[PDB]
Amino acid sequence: MEAVLTKLDQEEKKALQNFHRCAWEETKNIINDFLEIPEERCTYKFNSYTKKMELLFTPEFHTAWHEVPECREFILNFLRLISGHRVVLKGPTFVFTKE
Amino acid sequence: MEAVLTKLDQEEKKALQNFHRCAWEETKNIINDFLEIPEERCTYKFNSYTKKMELLFTPEFHTAWHEVPECREFILNFLRLISGHRVVLKGPTFVFTKE
Amino acid sequence: MEAVLTKLDQEEKKALQNFHRCAWEETKNIINDFLEIPEERCTYKFNSYTKKMELLFTPEFHTAWHEVPECREFILNFLRLISGHRVVLKGPTFVFTKE
Amino acid sequence: MEAVLTKLDQEEKKALQNFHRCAWEETKNIINDFLEIPEERCTYKFNSYTKKMELLFTPEFHTAWHEVPECREFILNFLRLISGHRVVLKGPTFVFTKE
């Protein structure tokens, strides 16, 4: 009984630590890919309703970075800062639309 | 990053220019087909609810002319002007109903 | 005349890019140091007024990460998330106080 | 990370325990010195503004007893009780003024 609850506590600590570590690794990889080599990972899609084409950035990993509000908010805000364009996250894609 | 964003801006300029050029070519073809040789392009359908026949004009191209509000508005207005009938655009068809 | 202003614009783009790149590198190094090897970088100081021991984390670099509101906010929020304590940034130090 | 935080928790417990132990030892020594042998430790200073002289008690230790509100309050209250005079703590000195 108490062994199972102790294992729950230990595994919750371990899983939360691993989840935050994976989220940090994912945001690290996302921003590093955008800053260094985004050409092999990004495409361009023309939204005709807004009569403009947007940069579709599809990061390789999606497991944990969007589940953490802080990591996702930082990713969006820093992509907006470094790029200067309006960045909106939809599903697994970052949409860069020139402002 | 900056190289990819500059490529995005250049591609947006080029794609917007190409999209407007294609829209102009499409409206040119639509109105030229209506003015010169519409007989092989349009059919006649009797709407029994309004108990009147309407001319169904089916332009060959639909890629860009309807996505530009100005080109579509001009097409409708000029078809109304030159034909004199009530022109309503539904889907890919122009419905000419005698007024 | 215009050559100097063109140089100003080009150098402003370059310096903003370099500043944001340095800020990202600094936050990367800060969080990596905290997650992997903080023991040789952080100390412990007992605040007697609050009668509690706080972790004094002194990141190696301070050039750009704190000047960017987004990077600093993300650093503080993510340190609070991963550590679970209360993290306050004063000067060059992160103070971790147990909650 | 987690090792450093566990060390923080353990060292906070140890430092709080040591701080309270030192405060208790200091109040013990202060009150024992006042009760048993205060002549070698106390002086007399004539405040002419209040036209009276006060007993200046300068305890040997000052590290922790004044930082604990409970220990300081007890020291002041018990010195007032055992002495019967108005006891005011200023800096490192107890001022005994006859009431």
Side-chain angles (χ1 to χ4, degrees):
Chain A
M1 158 52 177
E2 251 153 27
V4 158
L5 294 196
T6 303
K7 184 167 176 63
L8 169 150
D9 185 8
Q10 177 67 41
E11 203 139 339
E12 194 268 349
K13 261 159 43 66
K14 173 247 192 69
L16 206 37
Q17 177 177 178
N18 202 353
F19 169 64
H20 285 118
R21 198 81 48 99
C22 184
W24 167 244
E25 217 79 14
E26 280 187 341
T27 173
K28 241 180 55 151
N29 275 327
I30 288 176
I31 287 179
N32 286 354
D33 276 357
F34 186 71
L35 294 187
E36 293 134 32
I37 179 72
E39 54 207 68
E40 84 209 359
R41 184 151 300 81
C42 79
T43 58
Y44 316 92
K45 177 189 171 183
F46 198 101
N47 197 336
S48 274
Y49 162 68
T50 36
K51 62 172 182 179
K52 92 212 307 170
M53 92 209 292
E54 58 209 5
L55 179 70
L56 295 191
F57 187 38
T58 279
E60 198 173 0
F61 313 130
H62 292 308
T63 63
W65 66 264
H66 49 57
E67 265 137 46
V68 188
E70 278 77 3
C71 266
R72 179 188 60 201
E73 272 157 21
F74 163 64
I75 282 187
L76 292 186
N77 291 342
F78 188 78
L79 286 189
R80 288 167 191 166
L81 270 189
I82 189 50
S83 59
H85 305 159
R86 181 189 149 276
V87 181
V88 278
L89 165 67
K90 53 202 51 183
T93 43
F94 296 102
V95 160
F96 297 76
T97 46
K98 198 182 170 182
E99 270 195 352
Chain B
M1 211 275 278
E2 249 156 35
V4 152
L5 291 176
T6 302
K7 177 171 175 63
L8 157 73
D9 183 17
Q10 178 71 40
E11 203 90 359
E12 199 269 345
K13 261 163 43 65
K14 166 247 191 69
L16 208 36
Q17 176 179 178
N18 200 354
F19 166 66
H20 286 122
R21 197 81 45 97
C22 183
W24 168 243
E25 216 79 15
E26 278 190 340
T27 173
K28 257 191 27 182
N29 277 329
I30 289 178
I31 283 178
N32 285 351
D33 275 356
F34 186 68
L35 295 187
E36 277 98 31
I37 204 64
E39 55 204 68
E40 43 91 14
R41 193 136 292 104
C42 59
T43 64
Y44 314 81
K45 179 187 171 184
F46 193 96
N47 198 337
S48 291
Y49 162 68
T50 36
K51 63 169 186 179
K52 74 203 311 163
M53 211 165 257
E54 66 205 3
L55 181 70
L56 295 203
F57 184 41
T58 51
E60 198 175 0
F61 314 120
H62 282 309
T63 64
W65 67 265
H66 49 57
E67 270 145 21
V68 191
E70 279 78 3
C71 266
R72 178 189 61 200
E73 271 156 21
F74 162 66
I75 281 188
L76 292 186
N77 291 342
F78 190 77
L79 288 191
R80 287 165 189 164
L81 274 187
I82 189 46
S83 66
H85 306 339
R86 180 187 150 270
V87 181
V88 54
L89 167 66
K90 46 162 61 31
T93 38
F94 295 102
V95 168
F96 296 74
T97 47
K98 197 184 169 182
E99 269 195 352
Chain C
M1 159 54 183
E2 284 281 358
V4 160
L5 298 185
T6 303
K7 182 171 176 64
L8 174 161
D9 177 27
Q10 177 67 40
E11 195 140 345
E12 200 268 346
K13 263 166 42 67
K14 170 248 191 69
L16 209 36
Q17 172 193 184
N18 202 351
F19 167 67
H20 283 117
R21 200 81 51 98
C22 183
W24 167 244
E25 217 79 15
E26 277 187 341
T27 172
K28 240 179 56 150
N29 276 327
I30 287 179
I31 285 176
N32 285 353
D33 273 357
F34 188 68
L35 297 191
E36 296 134 49
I37 181 63
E39 58 206 66
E40 51 90 29
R41 188 140 289 102
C42 64
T43 62
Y44 312 88
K45 178 187 172 184
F46 189 90
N47 197 339
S48 288
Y49 162 68
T50 36
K51 63 171 184 178
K52 79 203 329 179
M53 211 150 211
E54 65 203 4
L55 189 71
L56 286 211
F57 186 42
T58 44
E60 211 183 348
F61 320 121
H62 294 116
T63 63
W65 66 265
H66 51 58
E67 271 145 20
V68 184
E70 279 76 3
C71 266
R72 178 190 62 200
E73 271 157 21
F74 162 65
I75 283 187
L76 290 185
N77 292 341
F78 188 75
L79 286 189
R80 288 167 191 166
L81 275 189
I82 187 54
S83 64
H85 306 309
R86 156 177 185 282
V87 183
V88 287
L89 166 66
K90 44 202 61 173
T93 50
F94 295 99
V95 168
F96 296 78
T97 48
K98 197 183 169 183
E99 268 197 352
Chain D
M1 211 276 278
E2 211 66 70
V4 158
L5 295 196
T6 303
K7 184 167 176 63
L8 171 152
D9 173 12
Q10 177 67 41
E11 203 139 339
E12 194 268 350
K13 261 159 43 66
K14 173 247 192 68
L16 208 36
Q17 177 193 187
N18 202 353
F19 169 64
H20 285 118
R21 198 81 49 98
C22 184
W24 167 244
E25 218 79 14
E26 280 186 341
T27 173
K28 241 180 55 151
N29 275 327
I30 288 176
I31 287 180
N32 286 354
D33 277 357
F34 186 71
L35 294 188
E36 293 134 32
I37 179 72
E39 55 207 68
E40 83 209 359
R41 184 151 300 81
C42 78
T43 58
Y44 316 92
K45 177 189 170 183
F46 198 101
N47 197 336
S48 274
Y49 162 68
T50 36
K51 62 172 183 179
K52 92 212 307 170
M53 92 210 292
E54 58 209 5
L55 179 70
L56 295 191
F57 187 38
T58 279
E60 198 174 0
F61 313 130
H62 291 309
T63 63
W65 66 264
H66 49 58
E67 265 137 46
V68 188
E70 278 77 3
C71 266
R72 179 188 60 201
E73 272 157 21
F74 163 64
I75 282 187
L76 292 186
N77 291 343
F78 189 78
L79 285 189
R80 288 167 191 166
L81 273 190
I82 189 51
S83 62
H85 305 159
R86 181 192 150 268
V87 181
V88 278
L89 165 67
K90 54 202 51 183
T93 43
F94 296 102
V95 160
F96 297 77
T97 47
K98 198 182 170 182
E99 270 195 352

